[PDB]
Design a protein around this ligand. Structure first.
Ligand SMILES: CCCCCCCCCCCCCCCCCC(=O)OC[C@H](CO[C@@H]1O[C@H](CO[C@H]2O[C@H](CO)[C@H](O)[C@H](O)[C@H]2O)[C@H](O)[C@H](O)[C@H]1O)OC(=O)CCCCCCCCCCCCCCCCC
Ligand SMILES: CCCCCCCCCCCCCCCCCC(=O)OC[C@H](CO[C@@H]1O[C@H](CO[C@H]2O[C@H](CO)[C@H](O)[C@H](O)[C@H]2O)[C@H](O)[C@H](O)[C@H]1O)OC(=O)CCCCCCCCCCCCCCCCC
Ligand SMILES: CCCCCCCCCCCCCCCC(=O)OC[C@H](COP(=O)(O)OC[C@@H](O)CO)OC(=O)CCCCCCCCCCCCCCC
Ligand SMILES: CCCCCCCCCCCCCCCC(=O)OC[C@H](COP(=O)(O)OC[C@@H](O)CO)OC(=O)CCCCCCCCCCCCCCC
Ligand SMILES: CCCCCCCCCCCCCCCC(=O)OC[C@H](COP(=O)(O)OC[C@@H](O)CO)OC(=O)CCCCCCCCCCCCCCC
Ligand SMILES: CCCCCCCCCCCCCCCC(=O)OC[C@H](COP(=O)(O)OC[C@@H](O)CO)OC(=O)CCCCCCCCCCCCCCC
Ligand SMILES: CCCCCCCCCCCCCCCC(=O)OC[C@H](COP(=O)(O)OC[C@@H](O)CO)OC(=O)CCCCCCCCCCCCCCC
Ligand SMILES: CC1=C(/C=C/C(C)=C/C=C/C(C)=C/C=C/C=C(C)/C=C/C=C(C)/C=C/C2=C(C)CCCC2(C)C)C(C)(C)CCC1
Ligand SMILES: CC1=C(C/C=C(\C)CCC[C@H](C)CCC[C@H](C)CCCC(C)C)C(=O)c2ccccc2C1=O
Lengths: 365, 121, 78, 101, 492, 191, 47
C-alpha cells in the first residue's frame, strides 16, 4: 500500500496542479514526528524518575494523576509560565539565543533515524555526517551562553563542559567509520539492510564488539550521563543563571539527545526493524505475501515494536548504569577517553580493514 | 545545469519548522508572564555574599591545546572518511598508503602524548 | 559583561550556603590555576552566644540549651 | 541561478576579506577575514566544478584540500597570536613599531 | 603486491624523499624515546641520511624522462639539480645550526624535524607538475617558514616579525590561490599543465588577470621589488640559521616553480610578462643597491643585498634563449656557497661575541685570522673579484644579456654592481684596515681562540670547505658548465 | 517551475545573508559579535553548498568550520580578553579611503573580467553520488598531496606544541664568550 | 615494562568485575518492596 500515492491520486481526482498539492503533504509527518518525539520525552522523564525511585527503594511522583504520568507534562506546562529573569549585564538577545543555538541542531537531526523501509524522512547519502556535524555545534551555543552568563564560575564550568564535549567527537566518528567501512555506505538504510538480510548471525554487535563499547562510552560521555557537569567548581557548571524557560529548554534538549543517542546506538549496532526468524520464511509459510497488506501492516507494527523495545532497553540500561558506576572526575574521564577509545578504535579500524581485505565473503561485498 | 539529487526539501522544511517553534515558545512565555520583565534591582549570582574578589580568570593553555589536537585529528578524520567509503573495489595499495597515513598520525599522537601537550593537573 | 582575563591570581569566594550537607562557612580560596595556594575561613553566621545564656540560669533551665549546643548527639554535653 | 551571480558574490566576498585584512581594528579579525578570502575561492572552485566540470570532479577535492590547509593555517596563526599576549601586554597591531629601519 | 599496478604507478623516482621521510621518523622517534641527552649523534645521522639521499640520484641521472603518479610528477635533470641544491643548502644549515640551537636554549630535534620537513617540501616542489600539488607544496614551505620564525621563545623581535610575515604570506597565498582557481576555471577542467596550455591560445583578459594573480604569489616567494616589504623586518628578528636556509632554499624553490610553471603553462603570452620582468628587475636592482648603502646593521645589509642580487637572476629569465636559464642555474649554484660562507662567518662572529653591528667589526686581524680571512674571501666573491666565481657567473650573465639583445639591463646591472661594491667593500674596510687603539669595546678580551667545546669542529670545517670550494670554483669550473648546460636544453 | 523559483529565492536570501553578515563582521566594534556572524557566514555558505551540488564537501565544511575552527577561534577570543582604550591615531581616514578605493578598483576589475570572459556551460546531468568518485580520486590522480597534507599537519602540530609549551623549568647554559645569554633568548643583543 | 601493562590489565578487569558486581547488587535491590509510608493515608502510631 501507499498512503502518499493514494493522497496524490485523490488530490489529482479533486483537481490541482501537482505542485502545491505535493508541497503541503510533508508538514503533517514533519509535525507528527515532532509530537511523538515530545511524547517520547514525556515518557523518558517519568521513566527515569520512577526507575531512579525503584533503584533506591522508593516510589516516584504520585498524587498528580493515575500514577503521576502527568508530572512531566505538568513540569513542562509550569516551567513555561515562570518569570524570565535576567542578570545585570548586556547582550540580552545573545543570552536568549544561546540556548536556541544549542536547541536547533539536535532537534534538527531527526531526519536521519529510520523506523522501517518507508517509515523515515531522509536517507540521501550521508545521514551519519548530518548527525555528527550537527551534534558538534552545541559547544558554540554553550560558550555563547557562558559568555552571556556574566559570571566567574559559570563561565569556567561552561568552558570545562565544552572541553569535555569536544573531546568525545573523534572516537564517536571512528566507531561510525568502522561500521561504514564494512557496510560500504553512509546511509542507515543499507546498514540496516545488511543486518536484516539474515537474522542474528548478521548483526554488527557480534562483528564489531569493541567498537560498540567505544561508541556506547562516547555516547554516555557526550549526552552527559556519567560526566556530571550540570559541585562543579563552586555549585554547578552551566547553571544557576537562567530561568524556568531556559532550564526547561536545556532539560528537553538533553532528553532529546539521550533519546536520539539511544535510538542511533541500536540502529547502528543492534538494528531496529529486525527479527530473529527471517521474514521470507514466515511469508512462504503463511501464504502469498507480495500485495496483501493484512500481514504487511502487522509486520510494520512488529518492526516499530522491535525498535521501541530496543530503544526502551537502551534507555533503561543507560539510566540504570547512571547510578551504578560511581562518579569519576572530568580529568580522569578525558584521560581514559583519549588513552582508551582512540588507540583501540584505530587498531579496531585496522583489523576491520584487514578482515575485509582477507576474506570478503561474510562482509559487505 | 540541473539540480537532481535524492532530495533536500525535507531538510529545509524541517529546519523551518524546528526554527519557528523556539521563538514561538519564547513569545508564549513572554505573553503569559505574570506581570512583566524589567526587574528593579538587578544582581548577579553570588552564593551568600557580595562580590569581594575579582572578575579575572587565570591565563591557561589547556582548553586551546585540547581544541588544537581536536582540529588536527578532525581534519584527519575528514581525510579518513572517503577511503573507508571507497573501499569496495579499490585494492591493497590504497590500504598500504592509508596504513602509512595512520602510522604517521599515530606518531603524531605519540608526540602529543609523551610531552606536556595535554595535562589537566 | 566585563570578564578581563589577566595574569593575576584568582580569588575564589565559596559562599556560606554549602547546599549539600554543610552549614555556614565563608571560604576564600586564592589560587593561580589547578591548585590551592591560600584559604581563609570566615565564621560568625551561627554564633548564638551560649556563654551569656548560662549567666543567669539554673541546672533545670539549661538542659535544652546544652542539648542544642551540638546537634549531632547532644547527650555528651548533658 | 547562474554562474555569474556566484562569481560576483565570490568577488564581493574577496573584496570584503581584503578590507577586513587591511583595517580590521584587531589581529584576530585579520585571520577571520583570511578565512573569508579563502572561502571566496572555495565558492569559486565549487561553482566551477558545478558548472564547467562534468563527471570527473576535482574542484571539490581542491576545496577540501584548501579547507584542511586553512584549518592548519588557522592553528599556526593562533599559535603565533597566543605568544604575543604572553610576551607583550597589549594586543593592538599598531603598537608593534619596534623593528624599524 | 601486484607488478602491473607498481609498474603503472612508477614509484621509482621518489626514493631520496622517502629516505628523508624515514630519517625524519627515526629522528623524531629518537627525540621521543631518549630526549635531550642524545644530541650528539642525531645531526650526524641526519647528515648521513642527506648524503645517502643525494648520492642515490646518480642512478636517477642516467634515466629516460618519464612521468609518474599518472601525470603528476616529472623527473628530469633540472629537478635533480634543484633537489641537490636544496640538500646542499640543508646540510650547510645543519652544520651552521648544530651549535646555534643549543646556544639559543631550545631542543635541536624539534627544529631538525621542521628543517627536514621543509627539505622534503622543497624536494617535492622542485618538480610539481600538478596544480593542487603546487599549492600543497607551496603551503607546506609557507607553514615551515612560519613555524621556523618564532623559535626564540618570547624574544620580542622574532614574534613581532612573524606576525607581519604571516599577514603578508597569507595575503600572497590568498592572491595566488584566487589566481590558481581562476586558471583552473579558464580551461575546460584539466589540472595538468600540458592539458591546460593546449586550450589557452585565445588571448582573453582573464588569462592576463590570472597570470598577474599567480605571478604575485610567485614573486612573493622570489621576493622581487613589489613584494620585498617583508624581508627587511623578517631577516633581522628571525634566527640566523633559519634565515640562512630561507635565503637560498625558498628562493631556489620559487625560481624553480616560476620556471616550470611559466614554461608548462604560458608558451603563448611571453612578451606580455617579459616587459613586466624587465620593469621588476630594473626597479629591484636599483632599489636594493641604493637602499643598502645607508643601512648600519650587518644582517639588514645582507638582507638588502639579497634583494639587490635577486634582480640579476631575472635578467636570465627575461631572455628567451637557451643560454639564459643556464646563467641562472650557474648563478644560483655560486650564490648557494657564497651565502653559506657569508652566513657561517656571521654566525661565528655573533656566537663568539654577541651582537653583530658594523662598527664593532674593527679589530679582527689580530684575534682570529681565519674568520676574517673567510669573511673577506667570501665577500670578495660576493662582490665580483675575478679570481673568484661570482665574477665568472656575472660575466656569463652579461654575455647572455648582450647576446640575446638586452643592452639596458646589462648596463643597469653593471651600474648597480659598481654602486654596490662601495658597501660590499665596507665590511672588509672595517675588518682588515682598522689600526690598534681604534676598535670598539668587547673585542679586546677574546677568550676562545681555540675551539674544543661541543662540536665547533664541524662548524669550522664547514667554513673551511666553503672557502676552498669558492676558491677552487673560480679558476676550475670546466665540468660545472657542462653539468649546467646538459640540464638546460630540455626546457622548450 | 516552482522548485527553481524557491531555489532562486533561497539563493538570493543566502547571498543577502552573506553580504549583511560579512559587513557585520568587519564593521561591528566587538570581537564576539564578529565571531558569531562568522559562524553565521559558515552556516549560510554551508546552505549554499547544500543548494547547488555539494553534500560531502558541505558536510566537511559544517564539521570543520563549525565544530573545530570556530570553536578554536572562540577559545582564542575568550582566552585573550582585556579592557583597553583604543587611542586615536593621527592618520586613519586617508588609510581607510585608500583601502576603500583599492577594494573598489579590485571589485571593478573582477567584474569586468567576469563580464568580459565567457564560459562554456555543460548540458550534461550531474552524478547522483558525490562521494564515490572523489573517494576514487584520492589514490589515482591526487596521491602525493594526500600524504603531504599529513606531513604538513604533523609539522603544524609539532610547531604549535613547541609554541604552546609553558617552560616551567629554568636551567642556565654554560658560558661561551663574554656576554652571558639568557635562557631561551637570542645572542644578538640590542643597543 | 610489561609487568606494568599486566598490572594495568589486572586493574582493568578488576574494575570491570566491580562494575558487574555493582550491576548485580543494583538488580538485587529491585526485588525488595518499598518500605515507605503514605501521608495522610498511612499515619504512624505515636508511642
Ligand atoms: C522510550 C522512547 C519512546 C518513544 C515514543 C514511543 C511512543 C510513541 C510511538 C509512536 C510511534 C512512533 C512514530 C512511528 C514511526 C514514525 C513513522 C512516520 O513518521 O512515518 C511517516 C509516515 C509516512 O511514512 C510512509 O511514507 C510513505 C512515503 O514515502 C516516501 O517518502 C518518505 C519521506 O517521507 C521516504 O522518502 C520514502 O522513501 C518515500 O517512498 C507512504 O506515505 C507510506 O504510506 C507511509 O507509511 O507519515 C504518515 O504516516 C503520514 C502522515 C499522516 C497523514 C495522514 C494520511 C493522509 C490521509 C490519507 C487519507 C486517505 C483518504 C482517502 C482514502 C481513500 C478512500 C477510497
Ligand atoms: C481523541 C484523539 C483521537 C486521535 C485520532 C487519531 C487517530 C489516527 C491515529 C491513530 C494511530 C494509531 C492507530 C494505529 C495505526 C497503525 C497503522 C500502521 O502502522 O499501518 C501500517 C502501514 C504499513 O505501511 C506500508 O507498509 C508497507 C509494508 O511494509 C512493511 O512490511 C515490509 C515487510 O518486509 C517491511 O518490513 C517494511 O519496512 C514495513 O513497513 C510498505 O512499507 C509501504 O511503504 C507502507 O505504506 O504504515 C503506514 O502506512 C503508516 C502508519 C503510521 C502509523 C504509526 C503509528 C504507530 C503505530 C501505532 C503503534 C503500534 C500500536 C499497535 C498496537 C497493537 C497492540 C497489539
Ligand atoms: C505546521 C506548518 C509549518 C509551516 C509549514 C512549513 C513549510 C515549509 C516548506 C514548504 C512546503 C513546500 C515547499 C516544499 C516542496 C518543494 O517544492 O520542494 C521540492 C524541491 C525539488 O524537489 P525534487 O527535485 O524532488 O522535485 C522535482 C522532482 O519531482 C522532479 O524533478 O525541493 C527543493 O527545491 C529542495 C530545496 C532545498 C534547498 C536547499 C536547502 C537549503 C538549506 C539552507 C540551510 C540554511 C542554513 C542557514 C543557517 C543560517
Ligand atoms: C611511517 C613511515 C612512512 C615512511 C614512508 C614509507 C615508505 C614505504 C614505501 C616506499 C615508497 C617507495 C617505494 C619505492 C621502492 C621500489 O623501487 O620498489 C620497487 C617498485 C617500483 O618499481 P618500478 O616499477 O619502478 O621498477 C623499477 C625497475 O623496473 C627497475 O629495475 O615499487 C613498488 O613495488 C611500489 C609499491 C611499494 C608500495 C607503495 C609505495 C608507494 C606509496 C608510498 C607513499 C609514497 C609517497 C611517499 C612520499 C610522501
Ligand atoms: C655529495 C656529498 C655527500 C657527502 C655526505 C657525507 C657522507 C658521509 C658523512 C659521514 C660523517 C658522519 C659520521 C661522522 C661522525 C663521527 O665520526 O664522530 C663520532 C660521533 C661523535 O661522537 P662523540 O665523540 O660525541 O661521542 C660521545 C662522546 O662524548 C664520547 O667519546 O659519534 C658517532 O658515532 C655519531 C653516530 C654516527 C652514526 C653514523 C650513522 C650510522 C649508520 C646509519 C645507517 C643509515 C642508513 C641510511 C638511513 C636509513
Ligand atoms: C666522502 C665523500 C664526500 C667528501 C667531500 C669532502 C668534504 C671535505 C672534507 C671533510 C672531511 C672531514 C674533515 C674533518 C676534520 C676533522 O674532523 O678533524 C681532523 C683533525 C682535527 O682534529 P685532531 O684529530 O687534530 O684533534 C684531536 C683532538 O682530540 C684534539 O683536540 O685535523 C684538522 O686539523 C682538520 C683541519 C681542517 C682541514 C680541512 C681540510 C678539508 C680537506 C680539504 C682538501 C683540500 C684540497 C685542496 C687542494 C688545493
Ligand atoms: C549486552 C550488552 C552489554 C553491554 C554493557 C556494556 C556497557 C558498559 C560500559 C561502561 C560505562 C562506564 C565506563 C566507566 C568505567 C570506569 O569508570 O572505570 C574505568 C577504569 C579506570 O581505572 P583507573 O582510573 O585505575 O585507570 C586510569 C589509571 O590507571 C591511570 O593510570 O578502568 C578502565 O579504564 C577499564 C575500563 C573497562 C570498562 C569495562 C566496561 C564494560 C564492563 C561490562 C562488560 C559487560 C560484558 C557483558 C557481557 C554480557
Ligand atoms: C508482540 C507485541 C507485543 C509484545 C511485547 C513484548 C512481548 C515485549 C516484551 C519485552 C521486554 C519485556 C523487554 C524489556 C527488557 C528490558 C530489560 C530487562 C533491561 C534491563 C536489563 C539490564 C540493563 C541489566 C544489565 C545487566 C548487564 C548488562 C550485565 C549483567 C547484569 C545485568 C543483567 C543487570 C505488544 C503487546 C507490545 C504489542 C505489539 C506486538
Ligand atoms: C663531536 C666532536 C667531534 C666529531 C666531529 C668530526 C667527526 C667532524 C665532523 C665534520 C663533518 C663530517 C663535516 C661534513 C662535511 C660535508 C660533506 C661538507 C659539505 C657542506 C659544505 C658545502 C660546507 C670532534 O672531532 C671533536 C674534536 C675535538 C673536540 C670536540 C669534538 C667534538 O665535540
Amino acid at each position: 500500500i501507499d498512503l502518499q500515492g493514494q493522497f496524490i491520486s485523490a488530490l489529482q481526482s479533486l483537481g490541482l496542479s501537482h505542485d502545491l498539492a505535493k508541497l503541503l503533504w510533508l508538514p503533517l509527518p514533519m509535525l507528527m514526528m515532532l509530537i511523538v518525539a515530545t511524547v517520547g520525552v514525556l515518557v523518558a522523564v517519568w521513566l527515569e524518575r520512577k526507575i531512579s525511585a525503584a533503584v533506591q527503594q522508593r516510589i516516584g511522583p504520585e498524587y498528580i494523576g493515575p500514577l503521576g504520568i502527568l508530572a512531566p507534562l505538568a513540569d513542562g506546562l509550569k516551567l513555561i509560565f515562570k518569570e524570565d529573569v535576567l542578570p545585570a549585564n548586556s547582550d540580552r538577545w545573545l543570552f536568549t539565543l544561546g540556548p536556541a543555538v544549542v536547541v536547533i541542531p539536535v532537534f534538527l537531526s531527526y531526519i536521519i533515524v529510520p523506523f522501517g523501509q518507508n517509515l523515515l524522512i531522509s536517507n540521501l547519502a550521508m545521514g551519519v555526517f548530518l548527525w555528527i556535524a550537527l551534534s558538534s555545534i552545541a559547544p558554540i551555543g554553550l560558550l555563547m551562553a557562558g559568555y552571556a552568563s556574566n559570571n566567574k564560575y559559570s563561565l569556567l564550568g561552561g568552558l570545562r563542559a565544552a572541553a569535555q564535549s569536544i573531546s568525545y567527537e573523534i572516537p564517536l566518528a571512528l566507531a561510525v567509520l568502522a561500521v561504514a567501512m564494512m557496510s560500504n555506505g553512509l546511509g542507515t538504510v543499507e546498514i540496516v539492510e545488511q543486518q536484516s538480510q539474515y537474522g542474528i548471525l548478521s548483526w554488527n554487535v557480534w562483528r564489531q564488539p569493541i567498537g560498540f563499547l567505544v561508541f556506547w562510552i562516547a555516547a554516555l560521555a557526550e549526552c552527559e550521563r556519567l560526566p556530571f557537569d550540570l559541585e562543579e567548581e563552586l555549585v554547578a557548571g552551566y547553571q544557576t543563571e537562567y530561568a524556568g524557560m531556559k532550564f526547561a529548554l536545556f532539560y528537553l534538549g538533553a532528553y532529546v539527545n539521550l533519546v536520539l543517542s539511544a535510538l542511533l546506538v541500536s540502529v547502528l549496532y543492534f538494528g531496529g526493524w529486525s527479527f530473529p526468524i527471517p521474514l521470507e520464511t514466515i511469508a512462504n509459510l503463511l501464504g502469498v505475501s507480495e500485495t496483501n497488506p493484512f500481514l504487511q501492516i502487522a509486520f510494520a507494527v512488529l518492526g516499530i515494536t522491535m525498535t521501541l523495545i530496543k530503544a526502551y532497553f537502551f534507555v533503561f540500561l543507560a539510566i540504570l548504569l547512571r547510578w551504578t558506576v560511581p562518579r569519576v572526575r572530568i580529568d580522569q574521564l578525558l584521560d581514559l577517553g583519549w588513552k582508551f577509545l582512540l588507540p583501540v578504535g584505530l587498531v579496531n579500524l585496522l583489523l576491520t580493514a584487514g578482515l575485509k581485505l582477507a576474506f570478503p565473503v561474510a562482509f559487505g561485498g | 545545469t540541473v539540480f537532481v539529487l535524492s532530495g533536500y526539501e525535507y531538510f529545509l522544511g524541517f529546519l523551518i519548522i524546528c526554527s519557528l517553534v523556539p521563538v514561538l515558545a519564547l513569545a508564549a512565555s513572554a505573553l503569559l508572564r505574570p506581570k512583566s520583565g524589567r526587574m528593579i534591582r538587578l544582581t548577579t549570582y553570588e552564593s551568600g555574599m557580595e562580590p569581594i574578589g575579582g572578575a579575572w580568570i587565570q591565563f591557561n593553555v589547556r582548553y586551546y591545546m585540547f581544541a588544537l589536537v581536536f582540529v588536527i585529528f578532525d581534519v584527519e578524520t575528514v581525510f579518513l572518511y572517503p577511503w573507508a567509503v571507497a573501499f569496495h573495489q579499490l585494492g591493497l595499495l590504497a590500504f598500504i598508503e592509508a596504513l602509512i597515513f595512520i602510522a604517521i598520525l599515530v606518531v603524531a599522537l605519540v608526540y602529543a602524548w609523551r610531552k606536556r601537550a595535554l595535562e589537566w593537573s | 559583561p566585563k570578564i578581563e582575563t589577566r595574569t593575576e591570581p584568582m580569588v575564589i569566594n565559596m559562599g556560606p550556603h554549602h547546599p549539600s550537607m554543610h552549614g555556614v562557612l565563608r571560604l576564600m580560596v586564592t589560587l593561580d590555576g589547578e591548585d590551592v595556594i591560600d584559604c581563609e575561613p570566615v565564621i560568625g553566621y551561627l554564633h548564638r552566644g551560649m556563654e551569656k545564656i548560662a549567666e543567669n540560669r539554673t541546672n533545670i533551665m539549661f538542659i535544652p540549651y546544652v542539648s542544642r549546643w551540638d546537634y549531632a548527639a547532644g547527650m555528651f554535653n548533658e | 541561478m547562474q554562474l555569474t551571480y556566484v562569481l560576483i558574490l565570490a568577488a564581493l566576498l574577496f573584496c570584503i576579506g581584503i578590507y577586513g585584512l587591511v583595517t580590521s581594528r584587531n589581529a584576530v579579525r585579520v585571520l577571520m577575514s583570511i578565512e573569508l578570502l579563502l572561502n571566496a575561492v572555495n565558492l569559486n572552485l565549487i561553482g566551477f566544478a558545478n558548472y564547467l566540470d562534468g563527471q570527473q570532479i576535482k574542484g571539490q577535492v581542491f576545496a577540501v584540500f584548501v579547507i584542511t590547509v586553512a584549518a592548519a593555517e588557522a592553528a599556526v596563526g593562533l599559535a603565533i597570536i597566543l605568544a604575543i599576549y604572553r610576551n607583550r601586554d597589549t594586543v593592538d597591531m599598531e603598537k608593534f613599531n619596534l623593528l624599524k629601519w | 603486491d601486484l607488478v602491473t599496478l607498481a609498474g603503472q604507478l612508477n614509484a621509482g623516482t621518489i626514493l631520496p624523499e622517502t629516505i628523508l621521510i624515514v630519517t625524519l621518523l627515526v629522528v623524531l622517534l629518537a627525540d621521543l624515546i631518549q630526549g635531550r641527552q642524545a644530541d650528539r649523534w642525531t645531526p650526524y645521522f641526519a647528515i648521513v641520511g642527506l648524503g645517502g639521499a643525494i648520492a642515490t640520484m646518480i642512478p636517477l641521472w642516467t634515466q629516460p624522462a618519464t612521468i609518474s603518479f599518472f601525470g603528476s610528477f616529472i623527473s628530469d635533470h633540472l629537478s635533480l639539480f634543484f633537489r641537490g641544491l636544496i640538500a646542499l643548502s640543508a646540510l650547510g644549515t645543519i652544520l651552521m645550526s648544530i651549535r646555534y640551537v643549543e646556544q639559543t636554549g631550545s631542543s635541536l630535534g624539534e627544529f631538525m624535524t621542521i628543517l627536514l620537513t621543509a627539505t622534503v617540501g622543497g624536494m617535492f616542489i622542485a618538480g610539481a607538475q600538478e596544480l593542487v600539488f603546487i599549492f600543497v607544496a607551496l603551503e607546506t614551505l609557507s607553514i615551515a617558514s612560519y613555524l621556523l620564525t618564532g623559535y626564540t621563545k618570547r624574544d620580542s623581535r622574532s614574534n613581532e616579525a612573524a606576525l607581519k610575515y604571516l599577514l603578508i604570506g597569507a595575503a600572497s597565498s590568498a592572491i595566488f590561490l584566487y589566481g590558481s582557481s581562476l586558471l583552473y576555471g579558464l580551461s575546460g577542467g584539466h589540472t595538468q599543465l600540458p592539458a591546460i596550455a593546449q586550450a589557452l591560445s585565445s588571448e582573453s583578459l582573464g588569462l592576463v588577470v590570472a597570470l598577474v594573480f599567480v605571478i604575485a604569489g610567485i614573486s612573493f616567494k622570489i621576493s622581487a621589488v613589489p613584494f620585498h616589504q617583508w624581508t627587511p623586518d623578517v631577516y633581522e628578528g628571525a634566527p640566523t640559521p633559519v634565515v640562512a636556509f630561507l635565503s637560498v632554499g625558498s628562493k631556489a624553490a620559487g625560481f624553480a616553480l616560476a620556471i616550470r610553471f611559466l614554461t608548462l603553462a604560458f608558451p603563448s603570452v611571453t612578451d606580455q610578462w617579459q616587459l613586466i620582468f624587465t620593469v621588476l628587475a630594473i626597479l629591484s636592482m636599483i632599489l636594493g643597491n641604493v637602499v643598502a648603502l645607508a643601512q648600519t646593521s650587518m644582517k639588514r645589509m645582507l638582507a638588502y643585498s639579497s634583494i639587490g642580487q635577486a634582480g640579476f637572476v631575472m635578467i636570465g629569465f627575461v631572455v628567451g634563449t637557451e643560454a639564459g636559464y643556464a646563467s641562472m642555474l650557474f648563478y644560483l649554484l655560486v650564490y648557494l656557497f657564497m651565502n653559506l660562507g657569508a652566513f657561517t662567518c656571521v654566525i661565528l662572529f655573533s656566537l663568539r661575541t654577541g651582537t653583530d653591528q658594523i662598527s664593532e667589526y674593527a679589530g679582527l686581524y689580530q684575534k682570529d685570522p681565519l674568520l676574517t680571512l673567510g669573511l673577506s674571501l667570501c665577500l670578495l666573491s660576493l662582490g665580483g673579484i675575478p679570481p673568484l666565481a661570482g665574477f665568472f657567473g656575472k660575466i656569463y650573465l652579461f654575455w647572455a644579456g648582450w647576446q640575446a639583445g638586452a643592452y639596458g639591463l646589462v648596463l643597469l646591472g653593471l651600474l648597480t654592481s659598481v654602486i654596490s661594491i662601495y658597501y660590499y667593500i665596507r665590511v672588509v674596510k672595517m675588518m682588515v684596515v682598522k689600526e690598534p687603539q681604534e676598535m670598539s669595546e668587547a673585542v679586546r678580551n677574546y677568550p676562545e681562540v681555540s675551539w674544543s667545546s661541543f662540536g665547533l669542529r664541524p662548524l669550522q670545517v664547514g667554513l673551511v670547505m666553503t672557502v676552498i670550494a669558492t676558491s677552487l670554483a673560480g679558476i676550475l669550473a670546466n665540468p660545472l658548465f657542462n653539468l649546467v648546460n646538459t640540464a638546460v636544453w630540455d626546457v622548450p | 517551475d516552482l522548485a527553481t523559483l524557491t531555489q532562486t529565492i533561497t539563493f538570493f536570501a543566502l547571498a543577502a545573508a552573506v553580504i549583511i553578515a560579512a559587513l557585520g563582521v568587519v564593521l561591528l566594534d566587538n570581537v564576539v559579535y564578529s565571531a558569531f556572524l562568522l559562524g553565521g557566514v559558515f552556516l549560510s555558505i554551508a546552505g549554499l553548498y547544500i543548494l547547488m551540488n555539494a553534500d560531502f564537501v558541505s558536510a566537511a565544511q559544517i564539521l570543520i568550520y563549525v565544530g573545530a575552527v570556530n570553536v578554536l577561534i572562540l577559545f582564542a577570543i575568550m582566552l585573550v580578553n582585556k579592557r583597553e582604550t583604543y587611542t586615536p591615531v593621527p592618520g586613519r581616514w586617508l588609510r581607510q579611503g585608500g583601502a576603500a578605493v583599492v577594494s573598489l578598483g579590485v571589485f571593478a576589475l573582477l567584474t569586468k573580467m567576469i563580464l568580459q570572459t565567457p564560459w562554456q556551460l555543460s548540458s550534461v546531468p550531474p552524478t547522483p553520488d558525490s562521494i564515490t568518485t572523489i573517494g576514487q580520486h584520492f589514490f589515482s590522480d591526487f596521491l602525493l598531496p594526500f600524504e603531504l597534507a599529513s606531513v604538513l599537519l604533523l609539522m603544524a602540530l609539532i610547531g604549535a606544541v613547541v609554541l604552546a609549551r609553558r617552560e616551567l623549568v629554568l636551567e642556565p647554559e654554560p658560558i661561551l664568550g663574554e656576554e652571558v645569554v639568557p635562557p631561551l633568548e637570542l645572542p644578538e643583543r640590542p643597543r | 615494562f610489561l609487568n606494568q601493562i599486566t598490572n594495568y590489565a589486572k586493574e582493568a578487569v578488576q574494575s570491570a568485575k566491580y562494575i558487574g558486581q555493582g550491576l548485580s547488587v543494583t538488580f538485587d535491590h529491585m526485588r525488595r518492596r518499598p518500605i515507605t509510608v503514605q501521608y495522610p493515608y498511612e499515619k504512624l502510631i505515636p508511642s
